[PDB]
Structures are given as structure tokens and as C-alpha cells.
Symmetry: D2
Subunit: 313 residues, 4 copies
């Protein structure tokens, strides 16, 4: 038998954190890939040393060659540029994603592929097209991270555990994201009940929705250098762990729609069930007219960037 | 001198032993297994001590037949107890004796009761112990809710982690599962009805299977009762207190006006934190649900007032 | 279609149920509880299913009375079994029946035997199953060693994680604890003798307490045997195989010349990995230790050859 | 009641990793301190978001003021410079450590203090002197990290789990460190037995000892920027976790000697038992004459740097 193999295309701050989480949870062999010579090998050696502290024998390897991803069960991609907005990175990152997709096809076409590079929803479509993989084995991490911030902001206000706060963000990653305050619950209890009983005001929720939208930039401005990576990494590994352990987790991810929400042949953020065979079910929310309008606006931005890529051959 | 947390288990039966093992595996603290049966808890504690080696942990587990070894406990979990109204007086006397020993030896403990009839015995226990009402509660709603949650999750084929479901009221045949509050990651279960994942006929069945889940396991086992989920449910409450997790858990707790109830313990959603039962959540129940909740507690008020 | 690993537990007694719970808590894979007793394993599986909700996991646990539900198992752990030479023929017949069903339904499984007398029954099991010798082994040394390790750790007041201690030979009264190989993070135990942490008199006592540890727990419990540490020990072996951990564990394994033994199972230190018993470690035992090891296996050779 | 409070003096790459480990293991409240304005607040916000993914409610806070460490149960210090050798950082880091020690005394004098800043063994003495804490509540992380590399290199050669490899490095952190090949065991089995049976050669072990000595620089040269931080962070948290959970772990750490090994009133790396009350026991190995000579050389370097600090008032 063989252990599960997890390849991380991109060994930066998010990639390194994901590798450490894989090591700590014993998810499988970890391969850190990067175009920067020797840098992934250094992090991999550091990580291997840490396995002694954790009392595991996880194998972590660094590499500058795509052939070492051969046989990967999961592939997570952070390659690209990350520093007008994210959407303007389309041309540069689309070409990096196509190269990555070509190598997935050649070396690990059975992999479950999780994309993080932005503009996320368009990069997912580029990767699927270039790799030739089933649509249900390629997806993007955005909604889990956006939802983790939404949940945390709500939980801290109500002073309950984030575990007991359910909250979802759908649509495209970026300022057109659509948080769903109407669906927020505390262990199933509508958040509306906590407004009535005085735990939180409608205005406070309104502000939390906007803080979720701008949370990425809030961290960039505080850090001074770089972007968030602890929550992004943890969100991607939660998706990967749901696949590798067939957990059947309900998670908002960027996935392929074929009629749901009135969207045809497009990757967009929606609640899905992730399990042993990839994206196994798309949950189609009963959106109100106003919510569907916000969601539809999100889709148009994505569909326009596709056409902007369309006419760039 | 710093000290590890101390967890005393009053009753070393199947639930007691299983609870001790979970405390060991999660390194929640020192474990004291108490029972009136000579030597049995000592022997289980030795078995558990050997298990720490395999788990590569340092947990201290001891068995005892003397109440004085529960002194300084941060958490106490009670399974001590034995025609079911025939048992009421016997178990009420056991609870008085436990409460008096808690009063003497660990007055600052967070106390979790499991002995049945739960809502009545935790009332008796709290009275005999003299501890703050927010530091004495009963385990039941978490167990009932975990069964409710599992049955839903299996029909929908989703993780139990992502099903939110609650059971309130008294523990027993008139427990009140709350179908209207079931959600899948916050999505109302009603949406999955419309989309064809589940029928309301099936949900009605799951509410009743939840009500009868304990007896269902008894009939299958032939001898004994469920204890894996009962033990796990009590430890989830104990961990929420020990690590100040602020979990929203349905537990049997003292009501001083909420839901229209006064001076009585009954299952309601609460926030469990480092200071015990920290918040009682008052659900906006419908008249139909409130009627079922009210019915649930007349039997409790009848037995508490009878006993008295 | 990708599939979770499948763990079949042949025997749903106290060890079987405890092993199932550990598999659930660690999410090691789907669990099948088999027993010849009707309904009992189904009921334990339902209890365990409810526990996944509290643990926020998706683990599938089912109980069965039919051998066909072990098909495709990646790991099989066997507790099936019942004047102790009176039991030999009865348990040998049970093992033949299990081995024949493994041969039919999960020929690629890693098989862990716990039924006693261990070294004899795993021999019988392997023969009836027709599986590779490196894919069939018995659990005992890990349990014996965990008791050895705990007793040392408690006297020295250090974590069991940092005590290395091994028991080799047959499981039983002539098991061979190896005092000369005990280390504290690699430091010879003899150094702690000189520094006054422990006496050799005390070490001699611990070797004998280890030999009699099982019976010590039986006498304390009044009814039944140890099962927390036995279950944990078998799952440590199962996890080492399932996650290819390459752990150095004393297990009852097939020897083809090592220690001077041929065509026999006996406890020795081995490396357990994703391909089963991957390496037999041949210790440089002293003449005194080798004499004890040799004595240990005459009783086994006597029973294996008798049975045959 | 109150949760355990862990303060991290220094919110760089090691500090951030330690905070994430604390969050994942639910060890207690985490405070990230740094002199860089806003940077710790950014990492703390990122980390708080990650608690939603992990289903915990750990509190993580960032700060630029020492008063927010008040009431800390554990303090871990990475403040200082990290980029002749480490020993030449003595004057700069000694003054930073004294400022840190003064604030520990004022705000959390009951803390268990774990130092990582180098030159480690001298910085520990500086911190104890400036903070006024008991000698048994101040120690340095070096040996656990050095030993984790020693263990990993041995385990990978023999192809067994690092869990089952016991190995120790004593003495001062740096090139005068003393790995103890004679004490290396595989689950108690002397490594010498594996030489006899052909798993490893004496020369291979010799080379592994030297690779352990230079492992820090091996990673620096590969990374290009910065130093190792996954294994350093994990090693410090293993010490912190042993204290907070009274684990009684046998770990090589820089601790106060009062006659052991012939050393009086000095912090040096030795095997110790860490438990609920700090450094609870010093294990005095039966060193051979050759090993004691290497250890003694280590002590002299430390004693000389002290005197070099001595005459610098």
C-alpha cells in the first residue's frame, strides 16, 4: 500500500503553513513545490525536524520539478502573484495556472485539486480546462475562508464558540462576495432571535457583513508585509481533509455549476458537500429576490473576466 | 504548587469507566473513579493507567471507595444510582448522600448529573449539595440531540458536524425534539424537504426514533444500556467548562422564570463556560412547541413535589 | 470510487467495543463489529454511531452477525473466543472458522489476533487463513510492555512516553520482560539505580508485577478482564499499519530462523508499517535472557504440536 | 476561573508559528507581543479567523505594550537579532533580554519563562537575573531542537519512526553542542546493535552527529532568507505543554546547575524533567571521560561569554 500524497504547488507562507498542518494531522506524504530554487527544500527539512517533536514519521519533501507531484491524491495551488484589485491579476495568473494544469494532467490526473490563486473563480476554470480533470475534482478555496471570518466576528460579539456559529459566504471571492446574514444561526437558532433578546443589533450585523468583505485588506494593512496565511491555509486543509477522509462536510467552495442558481458552465462559490469523490453535491439555497440579485451580480463579474480572458489568445 | 485539574466520577459503571477513558485520552486532568463496590474501581483505574503508556500520556487515574478522595475536584460527574417509580426514593437518597459529600469535600466543583429521572435527581442533588445553581446541571439534551443529529445526518448523507439539532424539556418519553430548528450548516431543514433530500414523513419518524433511542439500544444489547454516547456527552460538557469553550449545549439547568418555569431544572439550550452554566438561551418557541415543553415539565414538577 | 479504510472487529465483547470506539475517535476508518451473538453488536454500533455526533465525526459503524460484511477489510482484529487446556480445542476451532472466512472475504487484510493462548492461536489462525505470514500477527507484547512501562514510570515519576521497556517471548506466565533494555529517553535504567531514583529490588518486583498484571486486574474487578489497555494496544498496531508509521513494537510474529526459532509465532520486537510486519529485530540477548526466551517457547511448541 | 495565558515576546516567524500551535492544541489564551507596530495585531486577527476552521474559541491578541502580558502562565521569548557567529550577538541581545526580564518581573512574575534568543545559555542567565524569578522557572530551548534533528536523521537512515528513536544533545547551543551517540537507542535498544546487524555504519553515525551540529546553517543556506522556525517553535511548545499539563517529560534544556556535572551557578543544556512546577529535576548522565571533556569545553565557552558580559557595564 501507499500513503496519501499531498502536493502543494507554491511553497510560500500559505503553502508552508498547509504543509505543517498536513504534518501535524498525519494526512499523508507532503511535497512542497516552488519555482524558487532550494527554498522548498529548506522548509521541508525544517518540517521533517518538527516531525520528531510531534512523534510522527510524516515524509515532507521539497522540490523545484513538477515530476515529484506524480501520484498526488490532493493538489493545492498557491502559485501566482498576490500583491485596481485582484481581478487585474487575471493575465499573469491565468498563464501560471495553465502551466500548473498541464503538469497535473501529465503527472497526477487522479488528484483532487484545490485552487487558492486569484481571481479564484476564473483560475479554477482555467485549471480545469488545462488539466482535463473532471469538473468535480477541481474546486477553489474562498468561501470557507470568508465564512470563517464571518463566523468569528459573529461569535466574538455573542461570546459563544465559533463552533456553534453557522454562517456562509457565497459568490465570487473579492468585494462582490455575498455574505448571507439571513442564514446565520447559533446551533440552528436563527440569529434574528438574538437581536430580539438583545445580544446583537441589526446594525452590528450589518457592519460585520462589511468587515467580512474587507477582512483580507484589514490584515494586509496591519501586517505591513504580505497577506493572511493562517486562516487561508487552514481553510484549504479542511477541504483537503474532507476529501481524504470522506467526511461529507458542507462547505462553501468555488465549484462547477450546471444549471443551479440559473448558472451554466461556470465555477462560482456555493455551498457544496465535499467527500471521498470530490464535489459530490451542490446545495441550491432558497435565495430571496434581493439575495439572488447580489449573487447574480457576482456571477456577471466572473462571466465578464472569462470573456476578458476569452479575447486574449 | 501548580496542580492539574481533578475530575471525580461518582459511579464507576459502564458510563463511569468510559468517561474515565475519554478524560485520559484527551488529557483533561487527573481522574478519580469512585464507587461503593470494593476494588472494582481500583481495577479499572489500573487498566486505564496501563492505557496511558500506549497513549504516551502522563494521566493519573485512581480508583477509590472513599468520598474523601474527591476533595478539590474541579468537575464531578455522577452516575451513582440503581415499577420505575419504585426506584425514585432509592435514587433520591443516593443523590442526597452524594450532594452532602460534594458539599464537604469539593464545594467549588462543577457538577454534572446523569442519574435518572434526570431532571428530578439533579434538583435533589443541587439541594443536598448547597452549591450555586449555575454550578450543578444534568446531562441529557446533549445525548438526545446527538441521536437526533445522527439520524438526520445519515438520511441526508452529510457529516453530523454539519447538522444542528436540539432536544429540550425533560429527559424521557416526553422529551421535545425541535424539528423546526434543525439546520444543515444553518440552512433550514425545510429547504432539504423541498429539494427532495428528505420527506417530512421521515422527519416525523426521526423525532420519534430519537424519543425511543435509549430503549432501542437496550433491546438490541440484551443486557445493559447505552454508554458510549452518554459518556461522550457528559465529557463534552466537562470539557466546555474545563477549557472555557462557551459551547451552546442543551442541558438540564435551573430556571428562574425563563420559559415560564421557576425553581426547577429542565433541559434548555445554554452556554457552558469556565464559570459553569453561564447563559440560558430562551428560544422563541411556537404555541405548539411551548405546549409540549410545558407538558414535559408537569411530570417533573409532580415527582419533585411528591418526593418533597 | 475512493473508499475509506475498513476495520472489521471479529468479536464484539468489552475489548471489541472499546476498540471500535477508539477507531471512531481517531477516525481511522469504517468499523464493522462482528459477533455470533444476535443483535448485541448492532446495538453497540448504534450507541457508537450516536457518539460520532458528539465527536463531530462522520465515522461509519455497523454491527453484524454475518461474516460476509467483513469483505474488503484492510484490518481485522480478532477477540472471538471463550482447566485452561480445556479451552484449547474450542478456541482452535473458532480460529479455523475465522481464518476460513478471512480467506474468503478479505484475503488482503492485516490481521491482528488477541485470543489466548495468543502465540498458539495466531499460529492456528494464520494456517487456516492462508494469508502471508507478514500479514498475520498477535497482540501481546505491546500490552505487556505498556504495563512494564507504566510501573517504571510511576516509580521514577516520569512520563510513560519517556520510558522504553519491552516484553518478549510468549504471552503468559513465562513472558520475558527485559529489565536490561529499559531506558529513560535512552538513558540506561541502571544509571537511575546508581543515582537513587530506584532500587534493583524494586525493578525485580516490577518485572513480576508485569508478569501477573492481567490476573491482578481480574482479582480487583471481581467480574471480567482488562480491556482498556488491551484495546489500545491492538489499535496502536492497527494505526501503525494503516498510516505506515514504522513503529518498533513487540508483537507475536512468525520467525523463520531468528532467535533460533523456525515456523513459530512468538513475541519479538518488530517494525510495523504499511506492508505489515516489515522487519524482525534480532536483539543481542545474553545467555540468561536467551534461556528465558527459549523456555518461553517450549510451552508454545508443545501446544502447537499437540493440537496438530 | 481563568484560562492559561501564554505570552510570546517576539511575533516573528517562530513566534507566529508558536501561537498557531497554541491555538490548535487549545493550550490557552495567546498574546503576541512585538516592537513592530500593528504587525502582531495582524497575525492575531488571522489566527483568530483560523479558530473558526478548527472549531475552537481560543483567544489570540496582538500588542505592542508589555502590560498585556500581565498574568501570563508561560512566556516564550524570541526577541532579539538572529542574523563570527551567534555568540557575537551577546551585547545587543543581552540588553533586549534585560528589558524583557524587567517587564516579566513587573507584569507576570509567576510565569514559566522559555528563552530561545541566542547566545541561548547566556541569555537565560541574563533573563533570570533581570526578572528575579526562581531559577527553576527560567530555562532555554535548545536541546529539544538539536535532539529533534539528531532523532530525525537517525530515524530516516534506519527507516523507523522518530517516535522510537531516543537521542540527546547537551551542552551549549551552537557549534560547541555535544550530541551523545552512545546514548542513542531504538525503543531502548542500543544503536550499537544496529551497527552489528548492518542497519547503519559507525561512519554514518559520525556524519549524522556533524550534520546535527550544522543543521541550523544547512537550513539557512537552503532557505535564502531567514532561519528555521517550524522545528524551533514546536520544540518550545513541547516544553511549554510539559509545564502546563504537568507531563513530567524528560527533555534536554538549558537549565540552572548547582553542582551537577561539576558546574556551579550556570545555565547549560542538560537532560531535565519538566513538570507543573517548572524544571523539577536535573538528570546527571554518567558521561565517559571523553564526553565529559566535550561537555566541559562547552561550559568554558559559556563561562567566558558571561565574563565578557561581566566587563561590559
Amino acid at each position: 500500500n501507499k500513503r496519501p500524497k499531498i502536493s502543494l504547488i507554491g511553497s510560500g507562507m500559505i503553502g508552508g503553513t498547509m504543509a505543517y498542518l498536513c504534518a501535524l494531522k498525519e494526512l499523508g506524504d507532503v511535497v512542497l513545490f516552488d519555482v524558487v530554487k532550494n527554498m522548498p527544500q529548506g522548509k521541508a527539512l525544517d518540517l521533517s525536524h518538527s516531525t520528531s517533536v510531534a512523534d510522527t514519521n510524516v515524509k515532507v519533501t521539497g522540490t523545484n520539478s513538477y515530476e515529484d507531484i506524480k501520484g498526488s491524491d490532493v493538489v493545492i495551488i498557491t502559485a501566482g502573484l498576490t500583491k485596481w484589485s485582484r481581478d487585474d491579476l487575471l493575465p499573469i495568473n491565468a498563464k501560471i495556472m495553465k502551466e500548473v494544469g498541464e503538469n497535473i494532467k501529465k503527472y497526477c490526473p487522479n488528484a483532487f485539486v484545490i485552487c487558492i490563486t486569484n481571481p479564484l473563480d476564473v483560475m479554477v476554470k482555467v485549471l480545469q480546462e488545462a488539466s482535463g480533470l473532471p469538473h468535480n475534482k477541481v474546486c477553489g478555496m474562498a468561501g470557507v475562508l470568508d465564512s470563517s471570518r464571518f463566523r468569528y466576528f459573529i461569535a466574538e460579539k455573542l461570546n459563544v464558540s465559533p463552533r456553534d456559529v453557522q454562517a456562509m459566504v457565497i459568490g465570487a471571492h473579492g468585494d462582490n462576495m455575498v455574505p448571507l446574514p439571513r442564514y446565520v444561526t447559533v446551533n440552528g437558532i436563527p440569529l434574528q432571535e438574538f437581536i430580539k433578546k438583545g445580544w446583537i443589533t441589526q446594525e452590528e450585523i450589518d457592519e460585520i457583513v462589511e468587515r467580512t468583505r474587507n477582512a483580507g485588506g484589514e490584515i494586509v494593512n496591519l501586517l505591513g508585509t504580505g497577506s493572511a496565511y493562517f486562516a487561508p491555509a487552514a481553510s484549504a486543509i479542511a477541504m483537503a481533509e474532507a476529501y481524504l477522509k470522506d467526511q461529507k462536510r458542507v462547505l462553501p467552495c468555488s465549484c462547477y455549476l450546471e444549471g443551479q442558481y440559473g448558472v451554466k458552465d461556470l465555477y462560482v462559490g456555493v455551498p457544496v458537500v465535499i467527500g471521498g469523490n470530490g464535489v459530490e453535491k451542490v446545495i441550491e439555497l432558497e435565495l430571496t429576490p434581493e439575495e439572488k440579485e447580489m449573487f447574480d451580480k457576482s456571477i456577471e463579474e466572473v462571466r465578464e473576466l472569462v470573456k476578458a480572458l476569452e479575447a486574449l489568445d
